Design a binder for these strands. Structure first.
Lengths: 100, 100, 99, 100
DNA sequence: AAGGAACTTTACAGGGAACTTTA
DNA sequence: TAAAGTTCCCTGTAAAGTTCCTT
DNA sequence: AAGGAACTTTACAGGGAACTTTA
DNA sequence: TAAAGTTCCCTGTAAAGTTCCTT
């Protein structure tokens, strides 16, 4: 039920990977690319909901950009294609402001 | 500090105006048009944040459709132009569901 | 002699079981699974029509998805097969929005 | 609001055109084809809602079969194509049984 | 008719290859 | 003017969704 | 912010021709 | 089959939806 749990996690995940210089930005800096496995591992810790439950809510509330039927989208870094979990910077920025 | 207060207010504002029959809908029924002065009066009551503070978070989380650096939007009803605060019905339904 | 009695009952039944957490959703969240016995017990209360009379109208107006000669369809929850009364979320939504 | 007004109209319209022999059936007899103009003229009479308001509700509740972004669909009678308002016979049949 | 068993689809996971868009 | 961003093709998988088949 | 004016889109309306499905 | 049923091409329109631009 409690929405802060999901919002706090999104901010915490981005803050953690930002410190551990483990996050990449889109060309326009409007999006954050995170590895699907890293994010799914970090979401396993807090047992308020399942990893898929957290990603469904993030997708539905449009805090992450997904492809049809998936929790991630195709990206290109240094001419190589891969899948990444794409977090909207705009969604991270207020949620962070709210808890700052 | 509590994201639920903002989400509960959005649902409560829509529920209040729905009972008092004061809602206008978009052609596709995907959006709710509310008078700017009305929402700004209703948002004055609960003192967890300022009216502008509440509208900034609603805009940033994309629960309302606005024009760049405004909380308002231009609409058209019976050939006449006016400004309304435009609430996404999808955002209202997702949030009402998440609390009941 | 009133379609609203059937319509309002569908919304009321879904609202009741949603609060009491006795509702399960399909994978795509397009359908609501309800136990055949629970729904048949709840439909006994309001005497405007019989339980089978209410389920016939719900089926015919396609507010519920049914198998051939029944008012329930086969479902699967955690690899186990069973029969449930399957309510279209679409129907529930539109009807809820009417009132 | 009063759903009976919409249901009673659907049954009344089909009953009227059935007597005046202005009804055509699908091959499987599961659908009723009515001329778009005739039905829109008949829906003008009872002022509880607009013609477009009545057809939106009929479409939503799936009492009529429509094409994407329309209140009618393409049909074929004796090798000739035309557009008709297609009423589900199943929808007409309970709505009629309820009110007899 | 009722339900155990078995077949089909889906919603998540992935990639090669080539196209379109942007700084 | 080249790399990001996207789009069109596919594959893999476990459980949901559905149908077969027996009683 | 407010509002005149003018642009673009959408959800309704139509049809010829050709494709897919059914008796 | 051969006609029903459907889809793929297109066009037209008025008002909603949006943007431009000035105050």
């Amino acid at each position: 039920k409690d929405l802060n749990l999901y919002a706090k996690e999104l901010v915490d995940v981005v803050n953690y990977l930002m410190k551990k210089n483990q996050l990449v930005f889109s060309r326009n800096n409007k999006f954050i690319y995170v590895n699907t496995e890293t994010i799914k591992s970090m979401l396993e810790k807090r047992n308020y909901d399942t990893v898929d439950g957290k990603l469904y809510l993030w997708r539905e509330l449009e805090w992450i950009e997904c492809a049809e039927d998936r929790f991630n989208k195709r990206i290109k870094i240094d001419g190589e294609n891969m899948y990444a979990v794409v977090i909207k910077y705009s969604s991270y920025s207020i949620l962070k402001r709210l808890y700052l």
